[PDB]
Amino acid sequence: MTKNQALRAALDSGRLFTAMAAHNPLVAKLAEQAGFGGIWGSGFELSASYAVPDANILSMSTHLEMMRAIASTVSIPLIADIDTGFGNAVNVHYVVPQYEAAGASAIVMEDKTFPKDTQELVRIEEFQGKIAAATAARADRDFVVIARVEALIAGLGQQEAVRRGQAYEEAGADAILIHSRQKTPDEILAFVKSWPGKVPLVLVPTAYPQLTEADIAALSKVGIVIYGNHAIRAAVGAVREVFARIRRDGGIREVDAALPSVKEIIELQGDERMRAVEARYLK
Amino acid sequence: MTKNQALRAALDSGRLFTAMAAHNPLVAKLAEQAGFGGIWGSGFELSASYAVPDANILSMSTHLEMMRAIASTVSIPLIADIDTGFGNAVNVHYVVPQYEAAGASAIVMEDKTFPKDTQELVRIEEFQGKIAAATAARADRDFVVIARVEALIAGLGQQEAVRRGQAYEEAGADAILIHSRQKTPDEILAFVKSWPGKVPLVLVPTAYPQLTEADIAALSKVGIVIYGNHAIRAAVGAVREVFARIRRDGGIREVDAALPSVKEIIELQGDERMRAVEARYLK
Amino acid sequence: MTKNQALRAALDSGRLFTAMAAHNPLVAKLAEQAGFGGIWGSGFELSASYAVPDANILSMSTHLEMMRAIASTVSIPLIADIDTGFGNAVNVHYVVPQYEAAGASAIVMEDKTFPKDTQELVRIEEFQGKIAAATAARADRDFVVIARVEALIAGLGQQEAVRRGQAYEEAGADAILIHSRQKTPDEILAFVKSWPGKVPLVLVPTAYPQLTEADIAALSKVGIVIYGNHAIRAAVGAVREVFARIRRDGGIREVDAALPSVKEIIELQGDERMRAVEARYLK
Amino acid sequence: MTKNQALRAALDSGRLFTAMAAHNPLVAKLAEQAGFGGIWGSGFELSASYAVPDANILSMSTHLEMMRAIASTVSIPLIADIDTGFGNAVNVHYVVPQYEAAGASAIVMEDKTFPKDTQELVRIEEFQGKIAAATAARADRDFVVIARVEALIAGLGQQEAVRRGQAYEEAGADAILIHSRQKTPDEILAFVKSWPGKVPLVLVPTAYPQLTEADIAALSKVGIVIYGNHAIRAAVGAVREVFARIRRDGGIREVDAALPSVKEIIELQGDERMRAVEARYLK
Numbered sequence A, B, C, D: 001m002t003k004n005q006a007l008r009a010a011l012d013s014g015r016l017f018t019a020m021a022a023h024n025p026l027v028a029k030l031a032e033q034a035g036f037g038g039i040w041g042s043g044f045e046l047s048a049s050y051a052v053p054d055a056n057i058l059s060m061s062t063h064l065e066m067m068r069a070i071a072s073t074v075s076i077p078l079i080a081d082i083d084t085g086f087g088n089a090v091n092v093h094y095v096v097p098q099y100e101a102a103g104a105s106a107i108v109m110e111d112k113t114f115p116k117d118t119q120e121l122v123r124i125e126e127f128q129g130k131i132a133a134a135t136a137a138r139a140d141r142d143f144v145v146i147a148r149v150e151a152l153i154a155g156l157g158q159q160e161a162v163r164r165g166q167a168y169e170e171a172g173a174d175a176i177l178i179h180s181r182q183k184t185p186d187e188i189l190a191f192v193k194s195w196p197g198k199v200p201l202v203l204v205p206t207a208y209p210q211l212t213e214a215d216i217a218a219l220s221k222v223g224i225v226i227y228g229n230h231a232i233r234a235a236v237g238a239v240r241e242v243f244a245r246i247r248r249d250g251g252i253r254e255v256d257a258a259l260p261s262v263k264e265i266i267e268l269q270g271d272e273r274m275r276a277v278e279a280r281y282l283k
């Protein structure tokens, strides 16, 4: 079963699929080993690892090559964040095939205008055209196109958010990712209740840690839950703490015992496989 | 004062310079903020972040571009690990100028043969030629060339290790990095005592957490101490733990409070600077 | 004298500076050897060499790395085509320092909106902000910022074209590149006559081969003439012809004599330098 | 029929397959349009386009990404030059899957030692192990592994050249590429006559333009003829000539008529396809 079939099977079966953010292949491997359903190739986490704002500063190829390296490391589906498609429908058309060829099983594209000005969203018809270009360019029909509706964030209201969602589904979107920045999950939950479309919803509840997977499973219309930036946050917290301890203690004497050993990193690099290759082919 | 002058000033002054491993620019920024003297652009940490063995599997350009991204983020000197120079003296000659142009203040090159066979080290004269090619290719004489002696690891003994160190210094090496895999730091300390050369020594005491910076400062001949892989180890430990907690709890309800906030990552991405640029130029 | 000083000296002296398009470093080296004043790092020629449309399909990093490779090969100034700045003023701010660090002595940025819709140009004030962000981000004040006015191409008329030119110069543009698609050079020449600003003009007269350098030197207000796509055209013509001859003749028997020899390519690769490095450092 | 099946079908059918060198996708497209059977992703042509010696100076990723861009442009098989495998059998194992995933239908790997010293070839058994690692790592059994024997160039004689060829075929090589630097094709033809193996031979007769395809078809044992560097030579000759004419004439007045038009380059960039995408999806 291909990774694309696996993703599709999850969406079609009604199971709740979980995806975790990853800013490099090692983190993606740890996510797979932890049991998540898929990897989220987050633009926010990649730009954060590079210490640059998440505002289309990183090159498209830096993200695309990272997607390729992650997909060649894990056996679970990869969902790629392609922001606004790096341009208009023509750019979308040329970019989607490269993400599919890099091994991603899905892309997430949002309806925000690019670049930011001093409208917040692109016209409904313009975005429908971008979604249609994405589904036209894919080679494997199992490849998934997810349209991200930013109407709530833009402060446009629930009625406009549902209208865009329905228009994107009409254009060929396989799932709709709806996002909220409200303090409470009231807004998001009201959208889910009102959602009239046939395709599944995708939530990124980073702003609402109180919404557990059990709470989300209770929402039959949601097919995917994404943990949007927890890997980079976990890494920053531990690195910052270990660096401060080394500088306070003037060394690694107290900190070494608590860290994973060098041998554990070498195993995560796939040393066992390398050992078999060396044993059978280094002659 | 340029980063290269800063590094040189540290070596020449007699202060003990500390450098921390970094596998991406964010980690490098956290190292700078923590107070380390320099960043170590570790090939072991970069290959580990890609989940591939540290055996010249990653492309030279993947490491070189990472060095460029780290140097454009931090204000402290960057020491680049270039393994065996990606070839012979001709390759060294073409590669060193690219690392210098990427912003690194020093390179570390070791005398192991490449690629591994089924001798362990290259001939003394061959390596002298590689060091000479490195110092000939550098543009800024302040740029530092560090020769890494692997004779102890190769099991060749102390006398051969000192002989190579002296031969590399004669060829132009600005510092000698000596490494041991022995369980106890006895071997390393005996080498330091016996070292007759004029240039400073560089230690990577990952195998001896008991050797503190105070213990190393007591070794007048050592000018640099490098923490070789603690960033990737710290990151792996926290990521693996947070991923397991999310999967055990079926969500981020218990884990979110402990993590650095999204706002802290956005500040680390340099949002303040981005805010000034937006305020003054988005019109 | 730095490449940036060289460019500046040309602009300030009143000499007419010539720049030739190059899609790779070899072509750039041939341009230098032929005697041109500078290299034009054409987005049209790079996208053509990749067989993709010149419509922001290539990644910014593919062009930036090509600029780096060209600047490390030639000793004459490189003028980089950065299209619309890969975004708004914030993107311009983050991108310009990378082009300067790659070795380019100037960038050319145009006032077209990106991406294309189904207004043609961005507002005058928005572009002024992008030019100001570019000149604020440069480190070396000798680095040159050239603003390309597309008002004539957009069919907006001469009065609006001059107004934008003056507004961009007010925002800090060091030169104004004005372009025409009219069949005859009447439109372009009328703009030059009317130009009231103090900075030099830049012409890309690809559409008017009848306008010679002597004709352009006669235009005191023009400081740079760029040959926009002749390298890729020359290469396509000869390659296509040699390929057809080989397939017609069933071999290279008739064609080999006319081609430059393998020895000539090896010299262009800088074999002599490589021979000195081998002789002095391979030991 | 996949590109790999197409290549295999050519080798198995007994037809003589022709492959032309290409240093970028545009040249590769022109080769396809001219009628060649396949593209040769020459390391010599790519390093020449970058104005650097063909001595493993370019990064492996620079060549691999170029292979990816060429394969996504042409519909005919691509044969990738991977030099000595970028290391030993372990490196070969990690590299081959990346070339296959980039779209190449075959790789060519030679038995020279890397890097050059002050033996010329690696031991027969070491190379057999590298070939075995290559055929073990490929996913599609149709993917072709070509072993290049440099024994004649090394001055080791015909008997040793045939012995290596047979040993590499025993290790799994699908074809043997044999090369000569002798002035006359006597040496090469004698090798072909003596060749006792079952797999086809591959010739790169750049040094013998007198050996036509008809002469090679007459050699039943040769299954592929590669034109090794004619694209870069043709391009250099025309570019150098057009640049000299522009500088002599002080303009493009005399040269423009002879060049392919801008409209022809735009068609080669695939503008027609872009026009359909714009018409159907830009809304």
Ligand SMILES: O[C@@H]1[C@@H](O)[C@@H](O)OC[C@H]1O
Pocket (backbone or CB within 6 Å): A032, A073, A074, A075
């Ligand atoms: O080879 C893969 C292994 O590394 C892991 O990810 O589990 C599934 C496999 O297909």
Ligand SMILES: O[C@@H]1[C@@H](O)[C@@H](O)OC[C@H]1O
Pocket (backbone or CB within 6 Å): B032, B073, B074, B075
């Ligand atoms: O701009 C730099 C700042 O970001 C930090 O790293 O401290 C020193 C500065 O030069």
Ligand SMILES: O[C@@H]1[C@@H](O)[C@@H](O)OC[C@H]1O
Pocket (backbone or CB within 6 Å): C032, C073, C074, C075
């Ligand atoms: O080294 C350079 C040489 O290669 C050429 O381009 O002419 C000027 C020099 O600075």
Ligand SMILES: O[C@@H]1[C@@H](O)[C@@H](O)OC[C@H]1O
Pocket (backbone or CB within 6 Å): D032, D073, D074, D075
């Ligand atoms: O789409 C391809 C076309 O562009 C050309 O190369 O011929 C064969 C096709 O498969």
Ligand SMILES: O=C([O-])C(=O)[O-]
Pocket (backbone or CB within 6 Å): A021, A042, A043, A044, A045, A081, A204, A228, A229
């Ligand atoms: O980048 C992300 O993680 C996102 O878009 O949610």
Ligand SMILES: O=C([O-])C(=O)[O-]
Pocket (backbone or CB within 6 Å): B021, B042, B043, B044, B045, B081, B204, B228, B229
């Ligand atoms: O890669 C490293 O960190 C090293 O070489 O010590």
Ligand SMILES: O=C([O-])C(=O)[O-]
Pocket (backbone or CB within 6 Å): C021, C042, C043, C044, C045, C081, C204, C228, C229
């Ligand atoms: O790309 C070019 O050559 C241009 O913009 O003129």
Ligand SMILES: O=C([O-])C(=O)[O-]
Pocket (backbone or CB within 6 Å): D021, D042, D043, D044, D045, D081, D204, D228, D229
């Ligand atoms: O690089 C080449 O073209 C070769 O190896 O023949």
Ligand SMILES: [Cl-]
Pocket (backbone or CB within 6 Å): A023, A024, A049, B023, B024, B049
């Ligand atoms: Cl990372």
Ligand SMILES: [Cl-]
Pocket (backbone or CB within 6 Å): A023, A024, A049, B023, B024, B049
């Ligand atoms: Cl990374």
Ligand SMILES: [Cl-]
Pocket (backbone or CB within 6 Å): C023, C024, C049, D023, D024, D049
């Ligand atoms: Cl090219």
Ligand SMILES: [Cl-]
Pocket (backbone or CB within 6 Å): C023, C024, C049, D023, D024, D049
């Ligand atoms: Cl190229």
Ligand SMILES: [Mg+2]
Pocket (backbone or CB within 6 Å): A042, A043, A044, A081, A083
């Ligand atoms: Mg994102």
Ligand SMILES: [Mg+2]
Pocket (backbone or CB within 6 Å): B042, B043, B044, B081, B083
């Ligand atoms: Mg290392």
Ligand SMILES: [Mg+2]
Pocket (backbone or CB within 6 Å): C042, C043, C044, C081, C083
């Ligand atoms: Mg352009």
Ligand SMILES: [Mg+2]
Pocket (backbone or CB within 6 Å): D042, D043, D044, D081, D083
């Ligand atoms: Mg080659």
